[model samples]
Structure formats: C-alpha cells, structure tokens
Target chain A: MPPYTVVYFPVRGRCAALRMLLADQGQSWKEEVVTVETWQEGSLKASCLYGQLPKFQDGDLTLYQSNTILRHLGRTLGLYGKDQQEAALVDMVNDGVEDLRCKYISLIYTNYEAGKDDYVKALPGQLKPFETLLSQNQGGKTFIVGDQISFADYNLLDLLLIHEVLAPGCLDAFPLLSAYVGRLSARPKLKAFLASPEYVNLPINGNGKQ
Target chain B: PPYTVVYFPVRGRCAALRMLLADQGQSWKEEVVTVETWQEGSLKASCLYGQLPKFQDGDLTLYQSNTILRHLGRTLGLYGKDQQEAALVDMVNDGVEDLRCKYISLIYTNYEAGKDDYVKALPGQLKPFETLLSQNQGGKTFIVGDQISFADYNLLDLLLIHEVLAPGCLDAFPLLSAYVGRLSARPKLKAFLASPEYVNLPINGNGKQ
Candidate 1:
C-alpha cells in the first residue's frame, strides 16, 4: 500500500488541488474512490468527522478538512513557505480562497439558477484581491507569497480554473491572474494530469454544470 | 499602542482571538467599527479582502481571523509542541470553523424557519468535537496536545457561544461538558467572559440568538 491514500467520490470538487499538488511533486498516492450509492449507505458518512468526503490518510494518521490536508502536505513537503511569516501569508491567501470557494459551492449546489447572475457580476471584486497580491509581489512574476510556489498556489489555480469554466473571460480584466493561470497550467506534470482521462472524466462539481 | 483589532462592535469572529489575548495576558486595542460608520466609510472598500477583523501590529497589517490567530500562535509559541502537533491543532480549528459557518448561516439567513431543524441536528454537528475529545487523554487535556494551543481558545469560544444559542447543548457529551467547564474556569478567561464587553453584545448581528 502507498503511504498516502485519498478517499473521495469521483468528482473533482475539493480534492483536485491536492491531486495536482501530488502529481506535480512526483508523489505517489492511492485513491479510494467511492460511488454515490455506496456513500448513501451512510456508514462512511457517519464515520466522517465533518460529514464530508476526501478523507485522507497518511500512513497510520487519518486527516480531514481539505485545507488541513493541504497544510499537512505543505508542512511535510516544504510547500508551506520559507519561514513562519511567509507561512502566515500563505494561510491568509488560502483562507481567502476558501471564502470564495464556499460561495461558489453554495451557488453551485444550493441555487445556481437564481444566484448565477449576481455571483458572476461580482466576480471581478472577488478575484481582484489575488491580482493585487500578485502585483505587489515580484511584479506578478513569482508565486503568490514568495519566490517559490506554496500550497496556496495549487488551491488558487484550481479556483481560477473552475471560475473560468463557470464564467468565461472572468480573469481577462486582471492581466496578472490570467498569466499566472496560464503559467501554472503549463507545467509539464500538471499539464499531463489535466489532460489525463482520470481528471477529464470527472465533473468540476457533482452537478456537472461546469 | 499594542496590537490593534479593527472589527465591528459585535463579537462575531473576533471572540476567540479576544479570549486568547486575555487568557494569554497579552495587551491589545479594539477599534470598534459601528455598522453605520462601516457602511459610510471607505474602510470596507479599502480592506484587502473587503472584510472586518483587520489587525495591525506595528508596521504590519493583516486580515482573516484564522490568519491572525495563527500569527499570534506562531509568535507566542501557542501553535503546538512540534510539526505533527501543529497539524493536529489545525485540524481541530478547521472543524470548529466548519460548524461556525453553519451557525452563522442559520443565524443570518434562515433563523425563523431553519432554527428547529438546525437545533435538531445540533447533536450530530457537535458530536465530532466530543469524539475528538475522547481520542485525546480522556478529554482532560488540550484538544491536540497536553499543552494548550491557539485552537483551544477558538474551540472554547465556539462551545461557549453554542451553549447560549442552544442551551444545554453540551450536556449529552460528558467530556465536552467538563471540557467547557474546565476552560471557562481559567481566571483570566472567566473574568473576560463575565465582563460587559462580552456579555452585552448580541450573540449574532441580527439579534436572533
């Protein structure tokens, strides 16, 4: 058995970022895929602390909460930051991404038809913070926090990718974000993984709208 | 002239951090922003993420409550004993945050109609923390390790406000009940909880809970 195991449904909803991170880092992990029918059996759901999918296990240690998984990987893999202050900055960026992702999840699952227009309209304001963070750091050339890429970069990349799918040309107004997305997506391993049948076969969310 | 916290007058997200400051014997200043003033001023727009609970320490300015907690945790050596313990601390905080989000949604978005179902489901929602307590040294020590981490402060505030929202909410779980009692008895935190600054504010902004 591999040292890392990610258990979740087939959809790429929240686990995609970690998949990309693991793939990019040449880390080998196992996937324990669950079907909706099996999930409805309720035992697995009951066992989940937060009643959510993407339960991760690293060797004997079990972890939940997608951000916690990212952070654990970040800490062990040296993707958090170069120092304590930089790690805090990375946490800030991840928290911001999480806030926006929560809104996006609400829109997709709860009421996409009614909320889509307003959500799309306010997209620029929501996306601008990252753009400003980028512009302020190394002129948008390096990663979000510092010279090296942190785990937040992977989360932000997935956020940007799905947002573009949800609302086309949303990042066009922000040159830095657009280029950053392009740059991150162009990485060889990530490019391969994005094109792979495994990732392409799954919907961005469970609803399959995007 | 110490650390400054700029947030709304109500104790929404800043409660835990305030408790941490008081419990740790740290001094900080509160820059309360009234709702009328917040709407009228450019502070909201100028905010990095356009949200409150902005913090300032000397030359550095930061937003996001968890970020602030972590900054304090790192600087004050309240994170954990080591890397593994730190991850466990984060896991607990994330769980606390998940439930807090659900609570906020119920209070602001669906109080009248949704309160019954929410309260009905409250036990299941809260059981995770109890289970976490069981995993530790039989619920007698901190959430992650033997020593208190920053997450303990956040979790304590979460449980305290939750009891007010749904009285006797922690009664079913003996461990959690005692946990809350134990944390509340800390002299500094106990005094702060009874003070008017914390007791007078509505548990939520809408005066629902």
Candidate 2:
C-alpha cells in the first residue's frame, strides 16, 4: 500500500499542488477519486471533519482541509523550510497564495461568467504581491522564501498554472513568475506527471469551468 | 520586549492567539489600527495580503492569524505532542477556520436576512467539533490530545463568539459547552478575557458583535 492517500473529487482543484509535491519528491500516493454522483449522496461528505472534499490519509491518521494536508506534507517531508524563521516565511507565502486561491475559487464556483471581467481586471493587483515576493528573493532566481523549494512553491505554481488557463497571457507581464513556473515545471518527475493522462485529463474544476 | 499585534480594534481574528498567549503566561503588545489609521492606505499597501492581524515577534514579522497562531504554537510548544498530533491540530484549526469564514460572511455581509437561517443551520456546523472532542478521550481533556494545541484556543474563541451571535449555540453539545467553560477559566486567560483590552473592543469590524 502507498504510504499516503488522497480522497477528493475527480477534478484537480485543491489537490493539484500537493500532488505535484508528491510527484516531485518521489513519493507515491493512492488517489481515491470520488465521483460527483457519489458526492451528492452526502454520506462520505458527512464523514469529512469539516464536511468538505480533499480528505487525506497517512497510514492510520486521517486529515481534512487541502492546505492542512499540504502543511502536513511540508512538515513530514522536511520541505517546510530550513528553520523556524524560514518556515514562518513559508507559511506567510502559502497563506497569501491561499487568500488568492480562495478568491479564484469564488470566481470559478460562484460568479464565473458575470465576474470574470472584474476579476481579471483586479487580478494584476492581487498577483503583484507574489511577483514582488519573487523579486525580493535573489532576484527571482530561487524559490519563494529561501533558496530551497518549500511546499509553498508547489502551491504557488499550481495557482499560477490554473490562472493561466483561466486568463491567457496573464503571466506575460510577470517575468519572474513566468520564469519561476518554467523552471519548476521542467523538473523531470513533475514534468512527466504534468504531461501524464492522470493530470492532463482532469478538468481544473468540477463545474466544467477552468 | 513583548510580541506586538497589529489589527483593527476588534477581537475578531486576533482573539484566539491573544487567548493562547494569555493562558500560556506570555505577554504581547496590541498595536491597534483604528479605522482612521487604516484609511490612510499607507499601512494597507505595506501589508503583504492587504489584511490586518499583522504580528511582530522580535525582529520577524508575520501575517495571517492562523499562521501567527501556528508560529506561536510551534515556538511555545502548543502545537501537539508529536507529528501526528500536529497534523490533527491543523485539521481542527482548519475546521474552525471553515466555520469562522461562514460566520464572518453572515455577520458582515448577510446578517439581517441570513441570521435566522444561519442560526438554524448552526447546530449542523457545530456538530463536527463536538464529534472530534468525543473521539478524543471522551472530551475530558483538550481538543487533540492530553495537551492543548493552538487549535484549542482558536476553537474555544470560535465557540465563545458564537455564543454571543446566537446565545446558547453550544447548548446541544455538552462536550463543547464544558470545553469552552474549562478553557475560559484559566487564571491569566480569565483575567485577559475580562480586562478592558479585550472587553472594550467590538467582536467584528462592523457593529454586529
């Protein structure tokens, strides 16, 4: 049995980044895909601690919340950061990404058609902080926090990728982020995973939206 | 020499970490950002996420209330007993956050029309925490394990404010009601919760709580 398991919807929404982390780290995890029909039944949903998807399991331990799962992997895999200060900075970056991820999720799930125009207009300002973060770190050569790649890198990468799908050429203005994405995506295992049917076939969201 | 908390004049997000510090016998400075100061836009621009609850610990600064809670939880030994417990702590805190987000949306956005429905649905939302407590030592001790994690303080604060929103919200859950009472009675925490610094402020940014 794989040491880890991801129980989530078939879409590659919240689990994308952590899946990227596992692939990049050479870790194996079993995917327990829940169909939409299965989800509407509500039994499995009720079993969830917070009554949401993306429940994860590590041996006997079970966990909910996508970011919580990410942070757990970051901790156990020693990919959080080099030290406490760096770890705090890593959390800072991940939380910022999460804030924007929440906004993206709302846009997708709630107001995709009517709100996309305004969300796209405001996207630059929202993304500026991240670009600024990249600029501050060794002139965008290395990862988000320290030189090493923390769990936040995987998350931010996923957020950027989905946004690019949502709004094409969104990253053209962001040289650091563009290069950062390019560099991280080129990693051998992750690259293959990204090109694989398992990743490419899944829609970015369950609602048939990006 | 104390940690500094920067946020609007509300016990909204900072209340939990504040309670954690107080209960743990740690002191921190509260740098209140009044409505006037926040309107200036300068401080808002400087914030990474354009949000309040900015925290400074010695020379390092952090944003996001949960991040600050976990940071303190890590440094002050309040996270959990081990890695597994720490993950459980994160799970519990995230559950609290999911509920808190709903509470904020209801209070700030849709309080008038949504209040009745929200209160009606509140028990279902609150049941998960009670279930979690029941699974651990029959709800006798803290949330995750024998020792209290930062999530406990966050969950306790969530329950306290809900009591204000919809009085007796926890009435159905004996474990949660007792858990809140027991956590609130810690000597220093009791004083802090009663003190003017905490009592004088509104619970939310708007006049609701």
Candidate 3:
C-alpha cells in the first residue's frame, strides 16, 4: 500500500521469494521485470538504490537486498514475527535457504553432475536438522519459531519448493518436509499466488548459460 | 607508521583479504610475525586495532571478517563488475560465511572436534552451492558476470583454505571439489599459489586471535 514495487528480471530469479511473501501479506506491490539489455543501456539510478535489488520502492524510499526487503516488508506488515528473537530466527532460516539453494546454483553452473550430487546427497542431512525445527513448530503453532505464520514458514515452504524444482524427487529423501511443503502450499493466499499467472510464468530450468 | 599483515604465517582466515589485494596486482607488505613476537607485540598491535589480522594502510584501519572483506573488495575493485553484481556477490559471500564458515568455526574452534563435526556437517553445508553455481540469467557466463568477479576468487580461496585446514573437505561438496579442482588447474592461480612467499606463510588456524 506504500506504492511498493519489486524490480528484478521479470522472472523469479532473485525476487520470487519476496513475491511469495508479498502475496501472503496482501501487500500491494508491483513486479518490474527488466531485461539485462534494458538494464545495461539505460540509467540504473532507480535500480541501484543501495546498489541492488530486488530493490523495493516503498513510497519515496528505495531499499536493497532480498533479505533487507523481507525484513522491511515484515516490519510493515507485522509478519516479521513477534519480537527480536523471532526476527533473528526468521533470518537464520532464510540464511539457511541461501546456503542450501542460492549458492547451490553456482555449483551446477560449473559442474552439472557434481552439482546434482551435492544437492541430492546433502539435502537429506540438511532436512534432518530442519525437520526437528519444523516438528517443534508443529507442536505449538503453524509457523517456525513463533505462534503466528512467520516469514520463516514462508521461506521454508519457498525453499523446499525451489529445491523440488531444481531436483525432482529431492523430497523423497525427507518425507516429513515433503509433507510440510504440501501443507504450506495449501494456504489460501499462498495457494492462489502459486496458481497465479506470475508464479506459473517464472523462468524455466535453464542454467543461464547463454 | 607502516601497517602490514601480521598472522601465524599461513593463508587461513586472514589470507582471503591478502589474496583479494594480491589478485588485483596490488602490493602490500607481508610480515609473518612469530608467536613470540605476536605475544610480545600484541599489546602494541592491540593498541592499533581491536583484533589480530588487522590491516592499516597509513591512516585507515579496521577489523572483523565481513567488514574487512567488504572494505578490501571496495578498495581492490574486485567486488563486482557492476552495482547489482556487487550486492549479489556480497550477499553470497556473507551467506557462505554465516551458513558455512560460522559452523566450521563452531566445530573447529569452539567445539575442538573439527574432524567429527565437519564430517557430520559437511554435506548439509555444501548443498546450497550446487544451485547458485549455475550460470546466471544472461547465459550465466560466471557467477556475477561473464568475467570472473571478486566473489569467485573469494570463494576459490576460501574453499582452498578449508581443504588445507580440514583435509577430505572435498568429499563433502563434490561440486565445490570440482570447483576447487578447476581453480587449482588454472595456470595463474597455480603459479601464485606455488610462489615462494605463499609457501612461506605458516598455518595460522586462528587468524582472529
């Protein structure tokens, strides 16, 4: 509602996770997907605020970094969780996703089969740790680290979804996690977003090896 | 007063900043201060900065791994080829440091059970690299750009040092194993790594101390 606009490559490349949160929060925002050529030729003043995206234009303020944007939107929407410890936990989980997903993409770019092994073999161990956390969340609430549906839950769901997309049957190694993803995906707002046109039209599985 | 690199003598934690500067072909004094000297002069060194592995070039000085890396990347012009790339690279580097290196510190330094904890944690830590290493959207030539940016070098050196400190590290992340392999195969990197000065530095497992 603050005239917030999320800018990226018009794909889910970096900004997709942010979009998922926006959908759930009912935050009014625009998704500006620009091609690299347009970015290269034109002035990037708007894009380079804090010098990166997924830059958010909230009113007259321009923000940078996906995590920072998540935090900012979290603060605005009351979905960042209840307190300081909760906020840090959400970030801890988000940071885990980066370790498990974002950097993993770099491995595939360099070596395909090796990359696959890294994902398949290690994912189970990674999930085992999170399974404990997820189960703990289940005993008390619907989210991770808090009573409300925190950003960690959204991030966990998004990360697992991305993991499945990258390596089909990755979930076979961790059944509880696979089940958790199915449940999270069924949320009304999140389900509608996933079924929406933007989610459907995200970039296909290309290594960006143009 | 001249400020130089003072560590146990190896390319461990401190080396990332050193190599970052060197890769740009920038020259800085390398002083392999001994344990005796470190103990003796720690107070004087402490007077200048709050920690070891401190850098001082004339008037500028700072500490902390993340802050130091960011400063050096800015100084050396290896951070990114562009604005967005720099941010993304910083994010990735910070991600690795927090998610991977922090755990390594926990098991190795704090826990003192490096081998056992590493083996247990290795696979979990390395899983993320597989996805991020792929080519970017623009035909994904390199991580940040078609040209190799500072993050590549940062990652390469970090991976290389991890192996030195913890052997059999490659078995955990095979993709990174290949990445380390590929970097090791590069002629320039190999040559610099094999240089006299490089071989002379002692392994200072605790760069911060």
lDDT per model vs. reference: 0.91, 0.92, 0.61
- Cα lDDT tens digits, model 1, A13-130, are 9999999999988899999999999999999998987898789999888899899999999989999889877888999999999999999999999889989999999999999999
* Tens-digit lDDT string for candidate 3 (B107-180): 45675545566657655455545445643543234455556555666677666655664677667554566666
Worst 10 residues of 1 chain A by lDDT: A201-210
Q: What TM-score would every model get versus the actual structure?
A: 0.98, 0.98, 0.51
**What is the descending lDDT order?**
2, 1, 3
- Winner on TM-score between 2 and 3 is 2
What tens-digit string does per-residue lDDT give for candidate 2 at B1-209?
37999998889999999999999998788888889989999999999878888999999989999899999998988988988999899889988988899999999999999999999999999999999999999998999999988999999999999999999899999999999889888889899999998899889988996
Candidate with the greatest TM-score versus the true structure:
2
Could you report the DockQ of all the candidates, in the order they appear? 0.76, 0.78, 0.04
Model 1, span B56-78: residue lDDT tens: 87777889999999888988889
Q: Write the per-residue lDDT of candidate 2 for residues A1-210, one digit (tens) a residue.
A: 998999988889999999999999999999999998999998998788777889899998888999899999999999898988898899889988988999999999999999999999999988888899999989999899998988999999999999999999999989999999999999999999999999999999989998
Clashes per prediction? 0, 0, 29
- Better structure of 1 and 3 per TM-score: 1
Q: Which structure is stronger by DockQ: 1 or 3?
A: 1
Q: Kindly report the docking quality category of candidate 3.
A: incorrect
Roughly what TM-score does model 2 have, to 2 decimal places?
A: 0.98
When 1 and 3 are scored with lDDT, the better candidate is 1
Superposed model 2: Cα runs more than 4 Å off: none
Q: What C-alpha lDDT does candidate 2 achieve relative to the native structure?
A: 0.92
